[PDB]
PDB file of C-alpha atoms and ligand atoms in Angstrom:
ATOM      1  CA  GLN A   3      96.311 147.071  36.147  1.00 19.93           C
ATOM      2  CA  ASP A   4      97.161 144.815  39.032  1.00 18.02           C
ATOM      3  CA  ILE A   5      96.797 144.645  42.793  1.00 15.58           C
ATOM      4  CA  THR A   6      98.796 143.086  45.589  1.00 16.85           C
ATOM      5  CA  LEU A   7      97.042 140.791  48.085  1.00 16.97           C
ATOM      6  CA  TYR A   8      98.531 139.521  51.373  1.00 16.30           C
ATOM      7  CA  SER A   9      96.688 136.239  52.059  1.00 14.95           C
ATOM      8  CA  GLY A  10      96.530 134.296  55.311  1.00 13.34           C
ATOM      9  CA  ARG A  11      94.259 131.970  53.275  1.00 13.72           C
ATOM     10  CA  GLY A  12      95.820 128.876  51.740  1.00 15.27           C
ATOM     11  CA  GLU A  13      96.665 128.948  48.064  1.00 16.82           C
ATOM     12  CA  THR A  14      94.573 125.860  47.249  1.00 19.81           C
ATOM     13  CA  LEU A  15      91.528 127.785  48.485  1.00 21.50           C
ATOM     14  CA  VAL A  16      92.430 131.164  47.047  1.00 23.12           C
ATOM     15  CA  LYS A  17      93.949 130.562  43.633  1.00 18.71           C
ATOM     16  CA  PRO A  18      90.606 129.510  41.997  1.00 16.51           C
ATOM     17  CA  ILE A  19      88.944 132.660  43.339  1.00 18.79           C
ATOM     18  CA  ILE A  20      91.601 135.100  42.193  1.00 16.69           C
ATOM     19  CA  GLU A  21      92.002 133.410  38.817  1.00 15.79           C
ATOM     20  CA  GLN A  22      88.291 133.715  38.142  1.00 14.02           C
ATOM     21  CA  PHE A  23      88.421 137.283  39.398  1.00 12.55           C
ATOM     22  CA  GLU A  24      91.214 138.160  36.981  1.00 13.21           C
ATOM     23  CA  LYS A  25      89.323 136.401  34.186  1.00 14.07           C
ATOM     24  CA  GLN A  26      86.078 138.399  34.816  1.00 14.65           C
ATOM     25  CA  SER A  27      87.697 141.683  35.871  1.00 17.44           C
ATOM     26  CA  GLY A  28      90.891 142.213  33.887  1.00 17.88           C
ATOM     27  CA  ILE A  29      92.884 142.828  37.062  1.00 15.91           C
ATOM     28  CA  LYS A  30      96.006 140.832  37.930  1.00 18.65           C
ATOM     29  CA  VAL A  31      96.282 139.788  41.580  1.00 14.83           C
ATOM     30  CA  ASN A  32      99.816 139.405  42.923  1.00 12.00           C
ATOM     31  CA  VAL A  33      99.494 137.297  46.043  1.00 12.41           C
ATOM     32  CA  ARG A  34     101.873 136.830  48.910  1.00 10.77           C
ATOM     33  CA  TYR A  35     100.885 133.769  50.952  1.00  9.72           C
ATOM     34  CA  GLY A  36     101.556 133.371  54.705  1.00  7.44           C
ATOM     35  CA  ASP A  37     100.297 133.105  58.251  1.00  5.31           C
ATOM     36  CA  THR A  38      97.417 135.469  59.193  1.00  2.91           C
ATOM     37  CA  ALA A  39      99.115 136.659  62.428  1.00  4.14           C
ATOM     38  CA  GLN A  40     102.518 136.921  60.779  1.00  3.82           C
ATOM     39  CA  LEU A  41     101.266 139.045  57.855  1.00  4.53           C
ATOM     40  CA  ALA A  42      99.568 141.474  60.292  1.00  2.70           C
ATOM     41  CA  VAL A  43     102.894 141.903  62.133  1.00  4.08           C
ATOM     42  CA  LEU A  44     104.594 142.497  58.798  1.00  4.75           C
ATOM     43  CA  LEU A  45     102.089 145.139  57.798  1.00  3.52           C
ATOM     44  CA  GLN A  46     102.606 147.044  61.031  1.00  7.24           C
ATOM     45  CA  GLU A  47     106.361 147.026  60.499  1.00  5.59           C
ATOM     46  CA  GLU A  48     105.862 148.069  56.816  1.00  7.33           C
ATOM     47  CA  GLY A  49     103.397 150.772  57.798  1.00  5.91           C
ATOM     48  CA  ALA A  50     102.711 153.266  55.019  1.00  6.37           C
ATOM     49  CA  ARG A  51     105.396 151.858  52.752  1.00  3.05           C
ATOM     50  CA  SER A  52     103.630 148.509  52.429  1.00  3.39           C
ATOM     51  CA  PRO A  53     102.967 147.470  48.745  1.00  2.39           C
ATOM     52  CA  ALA A  54      99.852 145.575  49.847  1.00  2.80           C
ATOM     53  CA  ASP A  55      96.400 146.771  48.627  1.00  2.45           C
ATOM     54  CA  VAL A  56      94.292 144.004  50.213  1.00  2.00           C
ATOM     55  CA  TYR A  57      94.643 141.914  53.312  1.00  2.00           C
ATOM     56  CA  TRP A  58      92.688 138.698  53.684  1.00  2.00           C
ATOM     57  CA  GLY A  59      93.022 136.603  56.852  1.00  2.00           C
ATOM     58  CA  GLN A  60      91.223 133.852  58.727  1.00  2.00           C
ATOM     59  CA  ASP A  61      91.267 135.258  62.246  1.00  2.00           C
ATOM     60  CA  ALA A  62      89.645 138.437  63.625  1.00  2.00           C
ATOM     61  CA  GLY A  63      92.356 139.059  66.259  1.00  2.00           C
ATOM     62  CA  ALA A  64      95.036 139.803  63.607  1.00  2.00           C
ATOM     63  CA  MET A  65      92.538 142.013  61.683  1.00  2.00           C
ATOM     64  CA  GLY A  66      91.571 143.813  64.942  1.00  2.00           C
ATOM     65  CA  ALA A  67      95.179 144.686  65.591  1.00  2.00           C
ATOM     66  CA  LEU A  68      95.473 146.259  62.068  1.00  2.00           C
ATOM     67  CA  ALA A  69      92.319 148.311  62.647  1.00  2.00           C
ATOM     68  CA  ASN A  70      93.587 149.511  65.984  1.00  2.00           C
ATOM     69  CA  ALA A  71      96.968 150.340  64.359  1.00  2.00           C
ATOM     70  CA  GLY A  72      95.013 152.619  62.032  1.00  2.00           C
ATOM     71  CA  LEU A  73      96.295 150.866  58.895  1.00  2.00           C
ATOM     72  CA  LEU A  74      92.893 150.019  57.263  1.00  2.00           C
ATOM     73  CA  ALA A  75      90.823 152.108  54.858  1.00  2.00           C
ATOM     74  CA  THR A  76      87.168 152.778  55.552  1.00  2.00           C
ATOM     75  CA  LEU A  77      85.212 150.824  52.904  1.00  2.00           C
ATOM     76  CA  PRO A  78      82.372 152.457  50.951  1.00  2.19           C
ATOM     77  CA  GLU A  79      78.954 151.990  52.572  1.00  3.28           C
ATOM     78  CA  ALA A  80      77.857 150.138  49.367  1.00  3.04           C
ATOM     79  CA  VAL A  81      80.187 147.322  50.373  1.00  4.28           C
ATOM     80  CA  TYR A  82      79.405 146.766  53.998  1.00  4.50           C
ATOM     81  CA  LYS A  83      76.103 148.343  54.979  1.00  5.55           C
ATOM     82  CA  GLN A  84      73.896 145.541  53.692  1.00  5.97           C
ATOM     83  CA  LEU A  85      75.741 142.834  55.633  1.00  4.48           C
ATOM     84  CA  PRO A  86      74.624 141.429  59.009  1.00  5.11           C
ATOM     85  CA  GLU A  87      76.363 143.017  61.967  1.00  5.35           C
ATOM     86  CA  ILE A  88      78.264 139.849  62.957  1.00  5.50           C
ATOM     87  CA  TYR A  89      80.001 140.111  59.578  1.00  3.59           C
ATOM     88  CA  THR A  90      81.138 143.704  59.383  1.00  5.80           C
ATOM     89  CA  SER A  91      83.399 146.174  61.161  1.00  8.59           C
ATOM     90  CA  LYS A  92      81.366 148.605  63.284  1.00  7.97           C
ATOM     91  CA  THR A  93      83.023 151.440  61.354  1.00  8.43           C
ATOM     92  CA  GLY A  94      83.446 149.729  57.981  1.00  8.02           C
ATOM     93  CA  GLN A  95      87.176 148.885  58.020  1.00  4.01           C
ATOM     94  CA  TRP A  96      86.735 145.239  57.018  1.00  2.00           C
ATOM     95  CA  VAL A  97      84.064 142.730  56.022  1.00  2.00           C
ATOM     96  CA  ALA A  98      83.773 139.002  56.436  1.00  2.00           C
ATOM     97  CA  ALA A  99      84.007 136.997  53.157  1.00  2.00           C
ATOM     98  CA  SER A 100      82.890 133.918  55.085  1.00  2.00           C
ATOM     99  CA  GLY A 101      81.890 132.763  58.543  1.00  2.00           C
ATOM    100  CA  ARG A 102      83.873 130.383  60.728  1.00  2.00           C
ATOM    101  CA  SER A 103      81.702 129.763  63.749  1.00  2.00           C
ATOM    102  CA  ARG A 104      82.069 127.751  66.950  1.00  2.00           C
ATOM    103  CA  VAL A 105      79.626 124.858  67.397  1.00  2.00           C
ATOM    104  CA  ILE A 106      79.225 121.804  69.495  1.00  2.00           C
ATOM    105  CA  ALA A 107      79.673 118.478  67.752  1.00  2.00           C
ATOM    106  CA  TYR A 108      78.025 115.469  69.403  1.00  2.00           C
ATOM    107  CA  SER A 109      77.734 111.690  69.068  1.00  2.00           C
ATOM    108  CA  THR A 110      74.505 110.589  67.405  1.00  2.00           C
ATOM    109  CA  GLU A 111      74.928 107.089  68.899  1.00  2.00           C
ATOM    110  CA  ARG A 112      75.579 108.040  72.563  1.00  2.00           C
ATOM    111  CA  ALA A 113      73.796 111.447  72.701  1.00  2.00           C
ATOM    112  CA  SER A 114      71.354 113.770  70.936  1.00  2.00           C
ATOM    113  CA  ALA A 115      70.355 117.446  70.431  1.00  2.00           C
ATOM    114  CA  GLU A 116      68.532 117.144  73.822  1.00  2.00           C
ATOM    115  CA  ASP A 117      71.776 116.743  75.798  1.00  2.00           C
ATOM    116  CA  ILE A 118      73.147 120.038  74.416  1.00  2.00           C
ATOM    117  CA  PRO A 119      72.580 122.751  77.106  1.00  2.00           C
ATOM    118  CA  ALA A 120      71.638 126.398  76.964  1.00  2.00           C
ATOM    119  CA  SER A 121      75.190 127.683  77.605  1.00  2.00           C
ATOM    120  CA  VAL A 122      78.754 126.657  77.066  1.00  2.00           C
ATOM    121  CA  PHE A 123      79.162 127.371  80.823  1.00  2.00           C
ATOM    122  CA  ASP A 124      76.913 124.402  81.644  1.00  2.00           C
ATOM    123  CA  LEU A 125      79.446 121.861  80.349  1.00  2.00           C
ATOM    124  CA  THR A 126      81.350 121.886  83.674  1.00  2.00           C
ATOM    125  CA  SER A 127      78.586 119.741  85.187  1.00  2.00           C
ATOM    126  CA  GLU A 128      78.894 115.957  85.874  1.00  2.00           C
ATOM    127  CA  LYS A 129      76.665 114.830  82.974  1.00  2.00           C
ATOM    128  CA  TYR A 130      79.651 115.864  80.882  1.00  2.00           C
ATOM    129  CA  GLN A 131      82.292 114.301  83.166  1.00  2.00           C
ATOM    130  CA  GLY A 132      84.806 112.436  81.014  1.00  2.00           C
ATOM    131  CA  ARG A 133      82.749 112.967  77.835  1.00  2.00           C
ATOM    132  CA  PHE A 134      84.599 115.949  76.156  1.00  2.00           C
ATOM    133  CA  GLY A 135      87.472 116.600  73.826  1.00  2.00           C
ATOM    134  CA  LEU A 136      89.507 119.795  73.914  1.00  2.00           C
ATOM    135  CA  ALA A 137      92.118 121.138  71.532  1.00  2.00           C
ATOM    136  CA  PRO A 138      93.507 124.014  73.594  1.00  2.00           C
ATOM    137  CA  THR A 139      96.313 124.787  71.095  1.00  2.00           C
ATOM    138  CA  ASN A 140      93.778 125.344  68.285  1.00  2.00           C
ATOM    139  CA  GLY A 141      93.571 128.951  67.085  1.00  2.00           C
ATOM    140  CA  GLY A 142      89.737 128.847  66.890  1.00  2.00           C
ATOM    141  CA  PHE A 143      89.498 127.684  70.487  1.00  2.00           C
ATOM    142  CA  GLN A 144      91.926 130.362  71.637  1.00  2.00           C
ATOM    143  CA  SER A 145      90.052 133.079  69.824  1.00  2.00           C
ATOM    144  CA  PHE A 146      86.890 131.677  71.411  1.00  2.00           C
ATOM    145  CA  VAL A 147      88.473 131.994  74.857  1.00  2.00           C
ATOM    146  CA  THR A 148      89.564 135.572  74.135  1.00  2.00           C
ATOM    147  CA  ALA A 149      85.954 136.248  73.246  1.00  2.00           C
ATOM    148  CA  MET A 150      84.769 134.676  76.480  1.00  2.00           C
ATOM    149  CA  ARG A 151      87.132 137.065  78.309  1.00  2.00           C
ATOM    150  CA  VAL A 152      85.823 140.079  76.412  1.00  2.00           C
ATOM    151  CA  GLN A 153      82.280 139.050  77.136  1.00  2.00           C
ATOM    152  CA  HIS A 154      82.543 137.784  80.687  1.00  2.00           C
ATOM    153  CA  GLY A 155      85.890 138.829  82.248  1.00  2.00           C
ATOM    154  CA  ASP A 156      88.827 136.641  83.141  1.00  2.00           C
ATOM    155  CA  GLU A 157      87.661 135.419  86.557  1.00  2.00           C
ATOM    156  CA  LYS A 158      84.511 133.765  85.172  1.00  2.00           C
ATOM    157  CA  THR A 159      86.515 132.547  82.160  1.00  2.00           C
ATOM    158  CA  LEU A 160      89.266 131.005  84.289  1.00  2.00           C
ATOM    159  CA  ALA A 161      86.800 129.362  86.649  1.00  2.00           C
ATOM    160  CA  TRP A 162      85.233 127.715  83.592  1.00  2.00           C
ATOM    161  CA  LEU A 163      88.546 126.722  82.098  1.00  2.00           C
ATOM    162  CA  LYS A 164      89.674 125.090  85.383  1.00  2.00           C
ATOM    163  CA  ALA A 165      86.292 123.520  86.049  1.00  2.00           C
ATOM    164  CA  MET A 166      86.471 122.096  82.496  1.00  2.00           C
ATOM    165  CA  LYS A 167      90.032 120.834  83.079  1.00  2.00           C
ATOM    166  CA  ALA A 168      88.938 119.194  86.348  1.00  2.00           C
ATOM    167  CA  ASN A 169      86.183 117.285  84.576  1.00  2.00           C
ATOM    168  CA  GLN A 170      88.669 114.843  82.854  1.00  2.00           C
ATOM    169  CA  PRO A 171      88.625 116.114  79.264  1.00  2.00           C
ATOM    170  CA  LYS A 172      90.694 114.359  76.614  1.00  2.00           C
ATOM    171  CA  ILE A 173      93.217 116.629  74.919  1.00  4.32           C
ATOM    172  CA  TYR A 174      93.541 116.545  71.130  1.00  2.00           C
ATOM    173  CA  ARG A 175      95.834 118.127  68.553  1.00  5.80           C
ATOM    174  CA  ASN A 176      92.986 119.442  66.410  1.00  4.21           C
ATOM    175  CA  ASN A 177      89.319 119.414  65.424  1.00  5.48           C
ATOM    176  CA  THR A 178      89.730 116.532  62.924  1.00  6.60           C
ATOM    177  CA  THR A 179      90.975 114.191  65.668  1.00  7.14           C
ATOM    178  CA  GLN A 180      88.187 115.413  67.991  1.00  9.05           C
ATOM    179  CA  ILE A 181      85.488 114.568  65.435  1.00  9.19           C
ATOM    180  CA  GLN A 182      87.204 111.295  64.729  1.00  9.85           C
ATOM    181  CA  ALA A 183      87.206 110.569  68.468  1.00 10.66           C
ATOM    182  CA  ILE A 184      83.452 111.034  68.483  1.00 11.84           C
ATOM    183  CA  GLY A 185      82.837 108.413  65.797  1.00  9.70           C
ATOM    184  CA  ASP A 186      85.493 106.168  67.416  1.00  7.88           C
ATOM    185  CA  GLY A 187      83.620 106.368  70.736  1.00 12.15           C
ATOM    186  CA  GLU A 188      86.348 108.048  72.936  1.00 14.82           C
ATOM    187  CA  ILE A 189      84.071 111.140  73.577  1.00 13.87           C
ATOM    188  CA  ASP A 190      80.439 112.157  73.116  1.00 11.72           C
ATOM    189  CA  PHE A 191      81.051 115.907  72.680  1.00 12.91           C
ATOM    190  CA  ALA A 192      83.453 118.439  71.197  1.00 15.00           C
ATOM    191  CA  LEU A 193      83.669 122.221  70.709  1.00 12.60           C
ATOM    192  CA  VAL A 194      84.854 122.840  67.176  1.00 14.35           C
ATOM    193  CA  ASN A 195      84.925 125.226  64.249  1.00 10.35           C
ATOM    194  CA  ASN A 196      81.936 124.645  61.986  1.00 14.46           C
ATOM    195  CA  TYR A 197      83.635 123.608  58.751  1.00 15.87           C
ATOM    196  CA  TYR A 198      85.202 120.263  59.902  1.00 11.25           C
ATOM    197  CA  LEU A 199      82.190 117.877  60.148  1.00 14.16           C
ATOM    198  CA  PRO A 200      81.227 118.734  56.486  1.00 16.64           C
ATOM    199  CA  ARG A 201      84.461 116.990  55.368  1.00 16.61           C
ATOM    200  CA  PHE A 202      83.616 113.891  57.399  1.00 17.27           C
ATOM    201  CA  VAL A 203      80.047 113.794  55.978  1.00 17.79           C
ATOM    202  CA  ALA A 204      81.487 114.091  52.479  1.00 20.34           C
ATOM    203  CA  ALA A 205      83.698 110.988  52.853  1.00 18.78           C
ATOM    204  CA  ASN A 206      80.882 109.127  54.628  1.00 17.55           C
ATOM    205  CA  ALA A 207      77.427 110.659  54.448  1.00 16.64           C
ATOM    206  CA  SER A 208      76.397 108.524  57.498  1.00 14.29           C
ATOM    207  CA  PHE A 209      79.222 109.633  59.835  1.00 13.49           C
ATOM    208  CA  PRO A 210      77.749 109.420  63.423  1.00 18.75           C
ATOM    209  CA  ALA A 211      78.053 113.046  64.579  1.00 18.85           C
ATOM    210  CA  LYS A 212      76.087 116.245  64.282  1.00 20.52           C
ATOM    211  CA  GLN A 213      76.916 119.781  65.297  1.00 20.66           C
ATOM    212  CA  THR A 214      74.548 122.346  66.773  1.00 21.92           C
ATOM    213  CA  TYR A 215      74.456 125.606  68.716  1.00 21.69           C
ATOM    214  CA  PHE A 216      73.776 126.636  72.288  1.00 20.67           C
ATOM    215  CA  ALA A 217      71.007 129.178  73.136  1.00 22.23           C
ATOM    216  CA  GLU A 218      70.584 132.453  71.297  1.00 27.17           C
ATOM    217  CA  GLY A 219      73.411 134.821  72.026  1.00 28.56           C
ATOM    218  CA  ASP A 220      75.646 132.284  73.876  1.00 27.79           C
ATOM    219  CA  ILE A 221      79.381 133.028  73.573  1.00 25.67           C
ATOM    220  CA  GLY A 222      79.784 129.320  72.637  1.00 23.82           C
ATOM    221  CA  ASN A 223      78.179 130.244  69.232  1.00 23.93           C
ATOM    222  CA  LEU A 224      80.872 132.799  68.473  1.00 22.29           C
ATOM    223  CA  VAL A 225      81.221 133.618  64.773  1.00 20.37           C
ATOM    224  CA  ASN A 226      84.786 134.220  63.763  1.00 18.61           C
ATOM    225  CA  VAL A 227      85.358 135.334  60.209  1.00 15.64           C
ATOM    226  CA  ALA A 228      87.743 135.253  57.291  1.00 15.30           C
ATOM    227  CA  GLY A 229      87.920 139.085  57.052  1.00 15.85           C
ATOM    228  CA  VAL A 230      89.081 141.187  54.178  1.00 14.56           C
ATOM    229  CA  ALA A 231      90.218 144.811  54.084  1.00 16.00           C
ATOM    230  CA  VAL A 232      91.846 147.517  51.961  1.00 18.95           C
ATOM    231  CA  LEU A 233      95.082 149.137  53.312  1.00 17.10           C
ATOM    232  CA  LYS A 234      95.066 152.930  53.758  1.00 18.05           C
ATOM    233  CA  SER A 235      98.461 153.002  52.002  1.00 16.26           C
ATOM    234  CA  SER A 236      96.952 151.678  48.807  1.00 17.75           C
ATOM    235  CA  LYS A 237      96.719 153.890  45.708  1.00 13.93           C
ATOM    236  CA  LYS A 238      94.364 151.456  43.986  1.00 13.27           C
ATOM    237  CA  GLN A 239      91.303 151.333  46.272  1.00 13.98           C
ATOM    238  CA  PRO A 240      88.751 151.094  43.423  1.00 12.21           C
ATOM    239  CA  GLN A 241      90.344 147.913  42.054  1.00 14.83           C
ATOM    240  CA  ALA A 242      90.774 146.538  45.572  1.00 12.01           C
ATOM    241  CA  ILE A 243      87.091 147.180  46.339  1.00 14.12           C
ATOM    242  CA  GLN A 244      86.173 145.399  43.132  1.00 10.92           C
ATOM    243  CA  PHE A 245      88.018 142.398  44.466  1.00  9.59           C
ATOM    244  CA  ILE A 246      86.120 142.549  47.690  1.00  9.74           C
ATOM    245  CA  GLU A 247      82.826 142.891  45.920  1.00  7.55           C
ATOM    246  CA  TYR A 248      83.732 139.930  43.730  1.00  7.17           C
ATOM    247  CA  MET A 249      84.247 137.876  46.870  1.00  7.10           C
ATOM    248  CA  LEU A 250      80.736 138.824  48.016  1.00  7.89           C
ATOM    249  CA  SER A 251      79.146 137.901  44.702  1.00  7.90           C
ATOM    250  CA  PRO A 252      76.865 134.829  44.668  1.00  8.05           C
ATOM    251  CA  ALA A 253      79.225 132.548  42.729  1.00  8.06           C
ATOM    252  CA  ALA A 254      82.059 133.182  45.247  1.00  9.77           C
ATOM    253  CA  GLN A 255      79.805 132.819  48.279  1.00  8.14           C
ATOM    254  CA  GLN A 256      78.352 129.619  46.918  1.00  8.66           C
ATOM    255  CA  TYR A 257      81.933 128.336  46.435  1.00 10.13           C
ATOM    256  CA  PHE A 258      82.910 129.182  50.023  1.00  9.52           C
ATOM    257  CA  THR A 259      79.938 127.387  51.472  1.00  9.55           C
ATOM    258  CA  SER A 260      79.974 124.383  49.079  1.00  7.15           C
ATOM    259  CA  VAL A 261      83.672 123.900  48.621  1.00  7.32           C
ATOM    260  CA  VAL A 262      85.246 125.307  51.828  1.00  7.56           C
ATOM    261  CA  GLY A 263      82.291 124.427  54.107  1.00  9.76           C
ATOM    262  CA  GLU A 264      82.215 127.920  55.752  1.00 10.27           C
ATOM    263  CA  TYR A 265      79.136 130.087  56.182  1.00  9.05           C
ATOM    264  CA  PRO A 266      78.179 132.619  53.455  1.00  9.29           C
ATOM    265  CA  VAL A 267      77.747 136.196  54.455  1.00  7.88           C
ATOM    266  CA  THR A 268      74.940 137.046  51.991  1.00  8.43           C
ATOM    267  CA  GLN A 269      71.454 135.613  51.392  1.00  6.25           C
ATOM    268  CA  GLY A 270      70.472 133.780  48.200  1.00  8.56           C
ATOM    269  CA  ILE A 271      72.978 130.952  48.747  1.00  7.02           C
ATOM    270  CA  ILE A 272      72.167 127.255  48.660  1.00  4.42           C
ATOM    271  CA  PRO A 273      73.019 125.972  52.183  1.00  3.13           C
ATOM    272  CA  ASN A 274      75.347 123.127  53.007  1.00  6.14           C
ATOM    273  CA  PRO A 275      72.958 120.739  54.831  1.00  6.42           C
ATOM    274  CA  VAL A 276      75.497 120.094  57.626  1.00  8.60           C
ATOM    275  CA  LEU A 277      75.585 123.809  58.494  1.00  9.73           C
ATOM    276  CA  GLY A 278      71.962 124.674  57.835  1.00 10.38           C
ATOM    277  CA  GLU A 279      70.434 128.063  57.231  1.00  7.47           C
ATOM    278  CA  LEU A 280      72.292 131.352  57.697  1.00  7.42           C
ATOM    279  CA  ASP A 281      69.231 132.702  59.482  1.00  5.86           C
ATOM    280  CA  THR A 282      69.658 130.148  62.234  1.00  3.68           C
ATOM    281  CA  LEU A 283      73.285 131.288  62.764  1.00  2.00           C
ATOM    282  CA  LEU A 284      72.289 134.986  62.950  1.00  4.76           C
ATOM    283  CA  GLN A 285      69.896 134.173  65.807  1.00  5.72           C
ATOM    284  CA  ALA A 286      72.424 131.888  67.554  1.00  7.22           C
ATOM    285  CA  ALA A 287      75.413 134.240  67.324  1.00  4.88           C
ATOM    286  CA  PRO A 288      76.545 136.571  70.103  1.00  2.78           C
ATOM    287  CA  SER A 289      77.205 140.280  69.682  1.00  3.65           C
ATOM    288  CA  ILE A 290      80.939 140.820  70.020  1.00  3.54           C
ATOM    289  CA  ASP A 291      83.281 143.431  68.638  1.00  2.82           C
ATOM    290  CA  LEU A 292      85.656 141.081  66.860  1.00  3.35           C
ATOM    291  CA  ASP A 293      88.427 143.662  66.930  1.00  2.08           C
ATOM    292  CA  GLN A 294      88.655 142.900  70.664  1.00  4.13           C
ATOM    293  CA  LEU A 295      90.065 139.465  69.952  1.00  5.70           C
ATOM    294  CA  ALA A 296      93.474 141.099  69.352  1.00  4.32           C
ATOM    295  CA  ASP A 297      94.479 140.176  72.970  1.00  3.82           C
ATOM    296  CA  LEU A 298      95.752 136.654  72.440  1.00  5.92           C
ATOM    297  CA  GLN A 299      98.713 136.941  74.905  1.00  6.78           C
ATOM    298  CA  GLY A 300      96.111 137.575  77.633  1.00  5.55           C
ATOM    299  CA  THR A 301      94.284 134.378  76.741  1.00  5.15           C
ATOM    300  CA  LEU A 302      97.474 132.314  76.552  1.00  5.88           C
ATOM    301  CA  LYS A 303      98.284 133.477  80.050  1.00  5.92           C
ATOM    302  CA  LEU A 304      94.854 132.236  81.327  1.00  5.49           C
ATOM    303  CA  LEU A 305      95.321 128.903  79.583  1.00  3.56           C
ATOM    304  CA  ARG A 306      98.710 128.464  81.364  1.00  2.44           C
ATOM    305  CA  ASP A 307      97.068 129.366  84.660  1.00  2.63           C
ATOM    306  CA  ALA A 308      94.290 126.810  84.071  1.00  2.00           C
ATOM    307  CA  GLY A 309      97.021 124.280  83.197  1.00  2.00           C
ATOM    308  CA  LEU A 310      95.673 123.633  79.665  1.00  2.00           C
ATOM    309  CA  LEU A 311      98.890 125.059  78.114  1.00  2.36           C
TER     310      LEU A 311
HETATM  311 FE1   FE B 162      92.108 125.770  60.617  1.00  6.48          FE
END
């Protein structure tokens, strides 16, 4: 027996997982690598004739479009019902294998946890004037903006974007260069995905930055996910569920958090010290239907209006 996986996750991350899975399970996994968004397009075109059994991506927008297209199988309750709500489809069509949240990174030499405010909306103020990075072409940032739209509407969102632009931010290619820029002294603050600082702290356990959250429920604490789902078209749902349940087993979770630096979705996992406890994230995180992040074109439009793209 074998299954076919379409993976928006990189092979260097995935290969060790699937090989161990094959080893323990007996099931061959035939993987087709690619871009999360691109593989969702392909599935919609392929519709019911797709050979894929499992889809595993690293952005909720692409997954949300599949769910809306009616291409995803409802998972058994045994798979999803025990997971926290920020990590599961409302109606059980996908589950997070790992969490990729938004945080605020900050200089430990020119700032502290004190200077982090209650809301991401508060960063328009003067205290933050010329003290920020932005990476407005980063996927995680764009998905975060989509979420802000969902939560708050476009008007509030665009006022924030422009007010942020008008506060003299520095514009970076990615999160790595934003974190770098903190240690290098160009900026005191950045909004980033959570799994970047853990690499810096590896290479130099005294790197001069930490990352924290805003207040409970703030949209700036959004938890995106690497989501996984079974296709309706599949004729091998048992095997495909076994794969998913493997990915939620403690060994796999521990690997995601320790090797990849992403949050686990289950309890009983030894936390990366840079991230901290899962329980803290659950409190911090906002309640958002992640399937609503399918509207990227809307968000790009606003970014062009704000002049950030
Ligand atoms: Fe990335």
